[PDB]
Amino acid sequence: KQSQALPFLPYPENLSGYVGDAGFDPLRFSDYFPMDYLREAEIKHGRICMLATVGWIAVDMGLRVYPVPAGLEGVTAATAHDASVAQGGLGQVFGWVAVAEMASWIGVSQMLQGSGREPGYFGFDPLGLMKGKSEAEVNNMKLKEIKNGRLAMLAFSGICTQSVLFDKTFPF
Amino acid sequence: MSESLPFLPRPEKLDGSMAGDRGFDPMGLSEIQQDLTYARWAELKHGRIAMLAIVGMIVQEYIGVNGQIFAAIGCVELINFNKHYDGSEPGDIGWTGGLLKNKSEAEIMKAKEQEITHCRLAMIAITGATVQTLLFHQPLL
Amino acid sequence: DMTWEGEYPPSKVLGPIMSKMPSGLLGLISIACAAVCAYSIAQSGVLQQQPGAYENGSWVKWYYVLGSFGGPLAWGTHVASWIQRKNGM
Amino acid sequence: LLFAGWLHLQPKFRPSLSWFKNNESRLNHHLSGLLGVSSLAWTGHIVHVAIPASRGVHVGWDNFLTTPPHPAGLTPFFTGNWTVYAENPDSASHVYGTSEGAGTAILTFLGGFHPQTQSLWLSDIAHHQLAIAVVFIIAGHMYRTNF
Amino acid sequence: SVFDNYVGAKDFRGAEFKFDPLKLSETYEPFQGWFRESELRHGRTAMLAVVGYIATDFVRIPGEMYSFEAIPKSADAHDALIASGPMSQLLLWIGLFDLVVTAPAVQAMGKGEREPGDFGLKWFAPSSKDAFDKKREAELLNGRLAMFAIGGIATQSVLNGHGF
Numbered sequence: 058k059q060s061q062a063l064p065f066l067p068y069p070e071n072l073s074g075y076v077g078d079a080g081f082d083p084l085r086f087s088d089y090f091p092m093d094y095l096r097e098a099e100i101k102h103g104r105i106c107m108l109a110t111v112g113w114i115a116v117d118m119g120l121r122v123y124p125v126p127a128g129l130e131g132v133t134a135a136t137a138h139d140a141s142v143a144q145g146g147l148g149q150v151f152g153w154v155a156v157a158e159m160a161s162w163i164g165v166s167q168m169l170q171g172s173g174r175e176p177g178y179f180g181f182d183p184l185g186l187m188k189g190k191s192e193a194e195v196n197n198m199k200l201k202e203i204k205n206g207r208l209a210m211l212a213f214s215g216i217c218t219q220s221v222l223f224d225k226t227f228p229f
Numbered sequence: 230m231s232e233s234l235p236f237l238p239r240p241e242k243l244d245g246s247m248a249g250d251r252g253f254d255p256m257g258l259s260e261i262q263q264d265l266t267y268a269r270w271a272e273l274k275h276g277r278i279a280m281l282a283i284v285g286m287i288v289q290e291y292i293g294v295n296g297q298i299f300a301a302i303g304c305v306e307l308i309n310f311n312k313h314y315d316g317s318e319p320g321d322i323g324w325t326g327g328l329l330k331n332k333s334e335a336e337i338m339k340a341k342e343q344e345i346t347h348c349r350l351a352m353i354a355i356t357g358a359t360v361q362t363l364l365f366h367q368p369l370l
Numbered sequence: 371d372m373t374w375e376g377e378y379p380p381s382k383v384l385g386p387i388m389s390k391m392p393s394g395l396l397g398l399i400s401i402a403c404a405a406v407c408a409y410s411i412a413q414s415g416v417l418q419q420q421p422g423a424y425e426n427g428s429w430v431k432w433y434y435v436l437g438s439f440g441g442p443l444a445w446g447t448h449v450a451s452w453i454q455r456k457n458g459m
Numbered sequence: 460l461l462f463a464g465w466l467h468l469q470p471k472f473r474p475s476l477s478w479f480k481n482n483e484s485r486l487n488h489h490l491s492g493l494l495g496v497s498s499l500a501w502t503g504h505i506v507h508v509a510i511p512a513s514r515g516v517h518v519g520w521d522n523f524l525t526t527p528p529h530p531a532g533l534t535p536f537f538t539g540n541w542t543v544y545a546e547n548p549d550s551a552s553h554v555y556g557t558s559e560g561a562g563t564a565i566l567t568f569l570g571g572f573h574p575q576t577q578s579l580w581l582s583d584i585a586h587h588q589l590a591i592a593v594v595f596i597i598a599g600h601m602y603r604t605n606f
Numbered sequence: 607s608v609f610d611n612y613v614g615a616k617d618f619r620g621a622e623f624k625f626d627p628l629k630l631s632e633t634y635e636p637f638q639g640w641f642r643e644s645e646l647r648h649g650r651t652a653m654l655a656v657v658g659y660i661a662t663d664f665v666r667i668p669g670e671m672y673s674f675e676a677i678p679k680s681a682d683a684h685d686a687l688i689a690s691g692p693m694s695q696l697l698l699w700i701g702l703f704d705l706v707v708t709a710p711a712v713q714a715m716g717k718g719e720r721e722p723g724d725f726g727l728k729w730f731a732p733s734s735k736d737a738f739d740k741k742r743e744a745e746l747l748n749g750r751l752a753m754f755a756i757g758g759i760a761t762q763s764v765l766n767g768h769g770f
């Protein structure tokens with residue numbers, strides 16, 4: 058009845074499944090927006106930032122692709138966006154993200170009209186890793202994804218701001 | 230759920246009865262058609278033309294003649310005009326060399342499966358072969 | 371379905387999102403959209419008359435165009451704030 | 460169009476009565492595709508074909524893939540530096556149909572008339588049609604279709 | 607009826623002091639839960655403010671931007687730290703707290719599921735509600751006195767210029 062993260066606010070009451078729940082949501086976006094959309098957005102914000110904070114850390118700590126293509130030679134992670142769109146690069150990344158996001162949009166749109174799809178469910182599990190696991194263990198691994206995703210969202214925002222404001226690379 | 234896109238439900242008219250059925254209709258184009266006979270007729274014909282256009286672009290540099298080809302394809306499409314609207318088997322106009330009388334209908338299905346995967350591949354290839362011809366203007370290399 | 375009687379419509383005419391929002395939250399959002407639109411119009415006015423910032427349409431900023439469309443959003447959220455208040459939120 | 464009228468009377472291609480009553484999907488397409496996309500495509504014609512022809516440049520089907528309509532060439536569009544397309548318009552002494560006195564801007568808001576032809580600027584018509592295109596494409600996202 | 611719904615009808619001698627001359631709690635009877643959540647908020651702010659004016663006049667935090675050479679007594683700590691950053695840092699986090707915590711707290715108070723003034727600090731809170739009610743009037747009386755104390759300190763330190 059009371060929120061766990063904020064034990065003076067009531068429980069938001071729309072978070073009752075949803076493995077990463079702290080009862081946290083004070084502004085009650087779960088009251089106004091569908092929780093299937095909100096968890097799909099949290100998961101997608103999470104696994105993008107998990108790749109992004111590892112890709113910003115790797116590029117700032119040396120580690121270019123070898124051999125380096127033309128136009129990406131003296132370039133850090135804070136200047137690799139515009140240098141890659143001039144080289145080509147992100148133009149092909151944008152093309153294949155677009156055909157993934159247009160196809161996943163039909164997944165999100167059919168999830169909000171039924172279809173029983175879990176938010177943040179694609180078929181992508183090629184290395185097994187869920188070969189008949191129990192639902193208490195499936196929901197535990199889903200909690201590890203949301204917790205690590207929630208950390209990398211705050212981490213990338215720290216890394217990207219500090220690398221541009223104080224003008225340094227990631228071991229500041 | 231769909232085979233090709235496992236996060237999507239399987240399309241209702243895309244049960245596993247035609248060749249090449251990977252459950253791939255995300256935009257739902259098959260919901261409004263009464264049958265997929267005319268669309269398979271168009272998928273096979275686009276693929277068979279693309280298969281000849283791939284080899285036609287290979288043997289054009291590795292050696293109006295094509296005006297006789299469009300006149301020859303046009304005579305075949307004129308005499309078999311009603312077969313696209315009869316309701317018959319898509320792609321079949323009886324142009325086989327006796328090889329299609331063969332093993333049972335599981336083998337006829339895998340012959341149609343070998344055609345429609347070659348049809349779908351050559352449409353991606355002739356789109357690629359003509360775009361990177363118009364941009365770079367190299368034959369190959 | 372969406373027909374209604376009396377002095378105020380029910381909450382469901384606001385769509386599936388704003389029908390659940392409080393009237394005070396929709397009221398404060400409306401002032402926030404009105405202030406962003408009024409700031410965007412006034413700052414695009416001073417960018418038009420600045421002699422180094424108007425040439426070839428350089429007075430057009432993307433955040434001031436997007437900010438100026440808070441005007442119709444301030445109209446609608448204050449209408450929606452009234453409807454939630456009449457419906458007891 | 461004469462084959463399509465024959466085709467959509469054949470028994471497998473006759474559309475159902477519910478397809479004719481689908482008001483939400485028809486307005487969405489007719490605002491986007493019929494109005495907005497065609498206005499975007501007509502902006503594609505007059506930027507690529509008509510405004511070079513008024514600038515003394517021939518752009519036809521033989522050379523339109525290898526001749527950019529602007530010297531900056533579509534990188535100010537994707538970087539958001541859209542003021543490059545309004546940099547130098549045609550002069551007040553531009554001889555129409557020739558390159559003498561001719562500008563390179565493709566999307567202006569000049570207003571008034573070209574002084575020789577006493578007619579609208581083609582760069583104003585292109586920026587008109589492009590702004591009309593965006594408004595109608597947006598307007599075709601109002602109604603509830605399958606999504 | 608605010609004196610029976612809420613606690614704090616006391617004076618400095620502990621006698622019963624029903625103090626509402628303008629009768630604002632009867633003119634604005636739905637607002638009296640907001641009136642107590644904001645009286646405590648004004649009270650708990652002024653109690654930290656009166657300590658933070660006196661403790662600044664002897665101790666600074668050890669940075670050079672906060673040093674005694676930069677800000678002379680305590681009254682220049684506001685204006686000589688606006689562009690510096692520390693006033694913008696507390697404006698962010700208090701304003702983030704008031705948007706994310708306090709604004710959902712005052713709507714849960716209006717719905718009736720939390721008490722006004724309660725932000726979850728129940729560690730040293732006694733049970734046996736009258737004992738808690740005695741702690742709230744001690745918070746209120748020290749709060750109401752500090753609201754005049756920070757009014758007195760910040761006014762007298764400007765017209766007279768003296769510290770403490």
Ligand code: CLA
Pocket residue numbers: 155156159160162163166487488490491492495496595596599600601602603604605606
């Ligand atoms: C380029 C930007 C763009 C974007 C972001 C969208 C986005 C959308 N369109 Mg729109 N569409 C566009 C351009 C765009 N469209 C143009 C220029 C036209 C002609 C006017 C249309 C014609 C159109 C129609 C007729 C309909 C939509 C609908 C929709 C909505 C589908 C909701 C969903 O999640 O569907 C699930 C996902 C899909 C259907 C996959 C396609 C989604 C992409 C974004 C559309 C393709 C855009 C463009 C042609 C491709 C290039 C962009 C990029 C990928 C490189 C979504 C808001 C539907 C709607 O409900 O509107 C209210 C609808 O009925 N669109």
Ligand code: CLA
Pocket residue numbers: 478479481482484485488489491492493494497
């Ligand atoms: C994007 C996809 C698309 C496109 C391009 C079209 C295009 C068309 N359809 Mg539509 N149709 C579609 C999807 C589409 N349809 C869908 C999804 C459905 C089912 C829901 C239909 C169902 C349908 C039916 C039942 C019919 C059509 C018809 C038509 C034709 C309309 C007549 C015409 O040619 O004038 C095109 C006109 C122009 C291009 C110029 C517009 C001129 C107007 C006057 C401009 C004025 C507005 C201006 C910009 C602003 C106002 C000015 C202001 C200052 C006052 C046109 C070819 C009709 C037809 O003729 O079929 C053969 C018809 O009967 N359609």
Ligand code: CLA
Pocket residue numbers: 651654655656657658659661662665666667668672673677680683684687692696699700703
């Ligand atoms: C009304 C509250 C308040 C405000 C607005 C200020 C403001 C200021 N203080 Mg002061 N201070 C306060 C209370 C306050 N103080 C209290 C109660 C004490 C005694 C502990 C102090 C002891 C103190 C010292 C030793 C110094 C300052 C200094 C300063 C100045 C800049 C740096 C700073 O923020 O100090 C840091 C803040 C503190 C050291 C006090 C900690 C805050 C206490 C514990 C209450 C917070 C509890 C509460 C739950 C926090 C919630 C935060 C919320 C966002 C979640 C700034 C003008 C510095 C200066 O040089 O002045 C010019 C300096 O050296 N203050």
Ligand SMILES: CC(=O)O[C@H]1CC(C)(C)C(=C=C/C(C)=C/C=C/C(C)=C\C=C\C=C(C)/C=C\C=C(\C)C(=O)C[C@@]23O[C@]2(C)C[C@@H](O)CC3(C)C)[C@](C)(O)C1
Pocket residue numbers: 393394395397398400401404407411438439441442444445448451
């Ligand atoms: C309890 C709590 O929590 O809070 C309380 C606080 C408080 C304040 C007391 C309360 C209240 C009363 C409120 C909120 C009253 C608000 C009214 C409000 C906020 C708004 C009307 C806008 C009208 C029009 C006609 C606007 C635009 C109309 C138009 C046509 C445009 O903008 C055109 C334009 O856009 C385009 C088309 C193109 C652009 O390029 C250019 C421009 C920009 C010109 C509440 C409700 O009690 C909540």
Ligand code: KC1
Pocket residue numbers: 126144145146147149150151153154
């Ligand atoms: C399957 C179809 C396909 C083809 C046929 C193709 C071809 C080329 N890619 Mg692309 N590509 C993808 C697909 C395809 N690529 C996918 C799925 C991704 C992940 C989203 C992707 C990402 C990148 C990045 C970051 C770069 C990149 C490049 C090249 C370039 C190499 C020339 C060479 O090898 O000498 C040739 C044209 C680099 C470049 O030079 O761009 C100018 C470059 O930096 N690609």
Ligand code: KC1
Pocket residue numbers: 690691692695696699700
């Ligand atoms: C948890 C996230 C977090 C980060 C990442 C962060 C960062 C910085 N804080 Mg902030 N801060 C809080 C949180 C965070 N702060 C909180 C919860 C409060 C209480 C409301 C708070 C208050 C103050 C005050 C009074 C000052 C202050 C400053 C700095 C500055 C250099 C710090 C250093 O290196 O010692 C860096 C950017 C000082 C400053 O130099 O401003 C120019 C300064 O005077 N902060």
